[PDB]
Assembly symmetry: D2
Homo-oligomer: 470 residues x 4
């Protein structure tokens, strides 16, 4: 298990090929746009060494101690242990961090347990997993193919340029990678692959510092460094990037899938990576929802709005959604079964329910906070104003029905950062699409779900109807 210092040191030593507004970022650990998330990720690693949480966040094996997200679960109890670790880590940042390492570690763990799926590349997969686990490295993954203005370069989407004796050379780009402050980047199956697209049907991993690999940043959403003024954006801004592959060399040892269309398309499901990564997500969203509930309750109480029935109802609505997610989480673990490779995977029915329902619930939970805070959310002064000449006046005029001025503004700055700041609004779009387009996700659910039992019950029930004709 790695410490925060080791993580920071590694990033400083071999920084990702990050670009911010046309310029290379030489040291993300100190750059104003990235130092916040770097310190936050480091704290997650440090927590693994806190005596209070050591047993929750790590497990001992043959003299070594590894992060819980690497644990290949053999029993439901193990599954529960993985869940508690997902939850503890998520709670540190109120469920705002969407690409913490444990999400992808769950994917690689599943890939490794189901390694046979990869055929000749099986050993590569098992060894990559051992590497990530032993070094306790942080990963990120690049998704989505770009479009081409059709109003003939074969390397727009990431593709194999040539295969040598040392590996493959890839060229192209992935539209987005969240949290590039990782040691590694996964280029796994993303956009559905059509027949004949073997040149793009590949899966591999690379150090984020690889020559020819470029991460181009979007506008920074860090509001500032003050925790009072920007309680969340000052520390949990993960960043999103365009990922460019300029004739990047991928060593054979890092190739997991090569030129196999169907293998790529079925990878996540077959290996159980889908199940485990969705397991991390449901625990993460439960944490996120608990945070919104807490803020909503404190806001209502703080301004005396809790006496209003409709406010009580909005808060109760959040409680209902929280219980829904907890329920999906419980059933996912309790109904877990082993897959074709012997890997115990949490129930897909329950996890599909959670990841397809939350994208609809989140915008409403966000709306609820907006409706409770109302106009009190857009005219919040800075800590600098409290510290300034007018400080006395602010303490006299910014009080809440049950809160002093500094307390009220601090709480409202948080509610604001959770919803209306650039950071807060991004969280909304992210929840709506992080697992994919709801339109495609729902069509996928429709096709995979076994509807036969319900259809049969109705046909049986209809026998009596058709009998009137005999």
């Amino acid at each position: 298990a790695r410490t925060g210092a080791e993580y920071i040191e590694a990033l400083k030593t071999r920084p990702p090929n990050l670009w911010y507004k046309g310029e290379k970022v030489e040291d993300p650990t100190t750059h104003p746009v990235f130092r916040g998330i770097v310190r936050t990720m480091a704290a997650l690693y440090d927590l693994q060494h806190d005596p209070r949480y050591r047993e929750v966040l790590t497990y001992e094996e043959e003299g070594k101690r590894h992060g819980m997200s690497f644990l290949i679960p053999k029993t439901k109890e193990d599954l529960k242990r993985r869940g508690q670790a997902y939850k503890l880590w998520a709670d540190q940042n109120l469920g705002m961090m969407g690409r913490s390492p444990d999400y992808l570690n769950a994917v690689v763990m599943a890939y490794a347990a189901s390694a046979d799926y990869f055929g000749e590349f099986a050993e590569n997969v098992r060894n990559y997993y051992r590497y990530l686990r032993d070094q306790d490295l942080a990963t990120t993954h690049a998704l989505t193919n770009p479009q081409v203005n059709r109003a003939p370069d074969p390397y727009i989407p990431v593709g194999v340029v040539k295969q040598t004796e040392k590996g493959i050379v890839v060229r192209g780009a992935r539209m987005t990678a969240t949290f590039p402050l990782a040691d590694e980047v996964l280029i796994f199956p993303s956009t559905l692959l059509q027949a004949g697209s073997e040149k793009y049907a590949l899966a591999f991993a690379l150090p984020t510092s690889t020559p020819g690999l470029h991460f181009v940043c979007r506008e920074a959403l860090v509001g500032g460094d003050s925790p009072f003024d920007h309680p969340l954006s000052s520390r949990v801004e993960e960043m999103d990037c365009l990922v460019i592959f300029d004739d990047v060399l991928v060593p054979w040892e890092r190739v997991f899938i090569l030129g196999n269309v169907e293998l790529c398309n079925n990878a996540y499901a077959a290996t159980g990576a889908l199940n485990h990564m969705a397991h991390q997500v449901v625990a993460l969203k439960t944490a996120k929802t608990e945070a919104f509930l807490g803020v909503a309750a404190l806001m209502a109480e703080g301004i005396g709005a809790d006496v209003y029935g409709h406010v009580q109802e909005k808060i109760a609505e959040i409680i209902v959604y929280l219980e829904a997610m907890r329920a999906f989480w419980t059933r996912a673990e309790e109904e877990a079964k082993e897959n074709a490779y012997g890997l115990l995977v949490p129930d897909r029915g329950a996890l599909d329910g959670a990841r397809n329902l939350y994208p609809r619930l989140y915008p409403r939970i966000r709306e609820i906070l907006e409706q409770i805070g109302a106009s009190g959310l857009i005219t919040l002064p800075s800590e600098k104003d409290f510290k300034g000449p007018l400080g006395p006046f602010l303490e006299k005029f910014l009080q809440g029905a049950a809160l002093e001025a500094k307390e009220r503004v601090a709480l409202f700055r948080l509610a604001w950062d959770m919803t209306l700041s650039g950071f807060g609004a991004r969280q909304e779009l992210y929840e709506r699409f992080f697992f994919g387009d709801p339109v495609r996700m729902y069509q996928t659910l429709y096709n995979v779900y076994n509807k036969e039992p319900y259809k049969e019950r109705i046909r049986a029930f209809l026998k009596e109807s058709l009998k009137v004709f005999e």
Copy 2:
């Protein structure tokens, strides 16, 4: 365990004091308005004697065999057994029957296990439970107080007129009782009781044939007897009634609570009746949702609408809601704990989530069926037309893209009966309010839920914000 014949015989022998449009119903077992539901309830009892389901629907004890809904659960396994019985019974009528006996048997079972709660009336409670169980009787319950035109009779709502040595005399009325074709009626806590309302703070049970007890029916919703034309209303029309108490004598042995305001208000929660009855409901709604899923899938497939993405999405939405309910059900049982009286009760958090979410989901599930069936839902001929002179033309013009005419119409008559018939529309209102007004239910959830943990996590998170001032 009772058989259907015994149930039918008992109703015929001592019929409830039913009134339909100003006239007394002498024999509900043969009356066109009630014979359908009577036969349906009888079939539920007969199922307990089917070798295939005997072990699911009943349990053996000291030489006797009782219905599973009477089982006082000692373990989570017992809880699961009660759930499977709730489900099996619910599936017989596609979850359309809202007041099947097992719902209230769960209440009485809980009252009996937590009998001490009732003090001096404890023995009365235990004996009533043994009576219901041993005789395997069906119960119904009367709810809601009437209003008074304020634009001084003390007996509008049910109240104690006088207490004698043989019992109490009550006068007043309850606005509604669903499924009056029961052997017994429960007059338990309903409208919240205010201080000083001791005269109305009582709980008791009576045979539905009691002198002075009257059940006044609302418009009948039985569309007819044909299963082809009215697949559901011809058999699952439970009926709703105004319940009048004309100086009704309640024997002391049937009194469970007398003149105690707070006892009445906390009865359901304290005894665990709330938990167990909500347990029956969540399994019931899971069954109901599975039925809608089956009909929606068959409809889409039957008319070839399943090729459309948006239709696939609507069906997937039902799947998501189905999984949500299954999840609440699983967590309710897995998180069960014993209450203050040693009775194991399923988790309230999960059950409150389910019963407060479903009233919002049901109207949407109903809407989805309407959107898939569309105009094909309102111009459905009768089986009589297929049997008539134009039969040949109907078989040529009422086909579906993948269904013959009789099959399509039969399926659509069902979808119609499940949504747009008077029977189908009532089901919607019923789902919206059967457990109570959502406005009050949500306010109740807000007040009972422990929000402290989430509030504390936020206060802790805000410590860093207020620190900028030190």
Copy 3:
């Protein structure tokens, strides 16, 4: 202008070829399933002769008096006059009647004014209009093609079998025709026509008594004849029918379009029939919405629920929707322009807005009534119970906070009939689809609407963005 008696006499003399449950209906004017709507339609005709409304419902021309829905409007004032007549008629039945004659008279009026559109069949169109107007006949129209079980008859959808010197012979069927108690039936463009489908590309009209023409009824939704028990279904049940064409002879004089695909597809828009029929609809829905507002307000007041803020809000929501519809109606008339044939047509932008918004508003308006009435909506006794032995008890227990028992139940029976009765629920499905499938309607709006001005404003605004590169 016709009287109700003349309408009744004509129907009795030459009744439509109606079939109800395998049997022919010999006299709809007295049949329990149809006498209600017949009397209601007759009253609409009689109203044209009431001195108070004569000037609103009719106009004088060359010694004759015609129904206002036949008036070819030359000015905006004329348009307003047509609207007031639509409204007055709609108000008679609280906007519940969806196929009153004026709807289709607006279509034929537009067809006639734009007669040149029909080429060689132009005169036929003008003469048919004069016939309908002079005789003041009621029309209905048959829509939608049936499906074929693909899991080779060329006459499933209505098609030309053979053309003779006396006319054409058609065979096939239309899935639905609402209000078959009309003198005439229009077989105009419905399902979009594909290239090569000339055999089905035709438009004509026929007397509903034509040999070979059959109207097969769906389940009757008339709850009874009592206005207290069934205030709406006893009088405004229009009925929906499957329409069968068994080698029906269509005289050449009744042919408006023959074998022309594109002519059929553009008929409604080109002639302005779309605009005028939508004009009748917007006034009709305004009337319907005003009725729901009135019932909601009386209900809230009647039970004292009007003191609750959330109830006030739901009613205010209906008010907002009412104002929206009134606004669409006002703009439709104020922005009217003449079409390619010189016919003044109300603004399509506004009418498209109204007919595409109302299908979304109606279900919510219906929901609102359900939420206000709540459980008070499903346990309403009959007038027979008030007249029966228990009458005294009902008058004592069915009062409202501000209403006596008979008044409250009468009002609630209406709210019920407007939402939860089979009649009420059908109204919901009807509003969702009467003009067509919202999915297709929205795609049609997207393609016809001129989006260029808004796109241009944005391109202009973006010039400044692309300038940073120069």
Copy 4:
């Protein structure tokens, strides 16, 4: 009519008492947080002198030329002229500017026309209007009272400390004032006044530079100065402020209402200010909606998503909302009537409909843009990246199905700034609450709306129901 230069000069000469993060802003015309909006407001004034728009934005009177928002309308045509000016100005900034001067000029114009309402202060009102008009000054208004931590200063909300011979001295604060870069600030009726609150029942106006008057800023939402990167926040960030009154002297000539509770509460409605300000809003929201429609259409087309039916439907939905607003606008003007003071005011029914419907429509319109742009909205590089070393790669990988890279990103940066940037998200909260809390707004609509006509129609309809008893 003022020019932009004159506006800029005045602000520079006598700058508002603005505070940004504990520091006084000496020159807002050059300060990075305010120079954007200052230049934007100046451009609005300059437009009044453009020959193309002179006749739309101004009117000539006795040798002078005034801004159209000052025109006291005598006819519906005048009303239309005011509307066209509101619209033209709104279009300059895609309806994003919520407090452009014409909004409050409409209020003062109405106050002046209805001056008698103010009694002894009538002349003060008329003269203030002439002052604002003649000088063509920009105003802002301060709203909402602060709360007091009740878990005795009489001057928390703005109140009269003492009345002298030169005026009144006020102390207290208003929670928010949008667009403080104005010459004047209005302290008109805001929070509803209770009986006995005469000390707070006052209305007056002051120069924003008044001694003791302080404007404390909230976090700045200006993303930067680049129009490519921040197309809207770089120019339309109006800013919101806490307004502090430290013993501010209000000259008698600037007092409009003093110590009159009911006068304050009925001011906006009685004078017609409500009607006219809402008139500016409906035209403003129509402009805003047209902008979203344009961006949505260009986005769909730009990425080829316009071929998908569901995308076409979302765009059609925006079209429907656009038509709804245009309709409210048309009816508001066409149904205008004179108030008790002879001032022609646009219809309140229609304007109340628009301002109570839009707060519900806007979040959905915003959602629609998010659903179309999807993940393409959160990984948008800067113009600096296109200008940087990787420029060539971006032009190759950031293309749209029908757009080149720079064009696509520019368009998406705008869609982003309109929804997910801090500026964009604030617009959402602002639309939800700018006119007030929807809960209170709906209750206000309920109480003011005349529901009698609809209630009467139903009572009449129910006569037939109660007749069955005679």
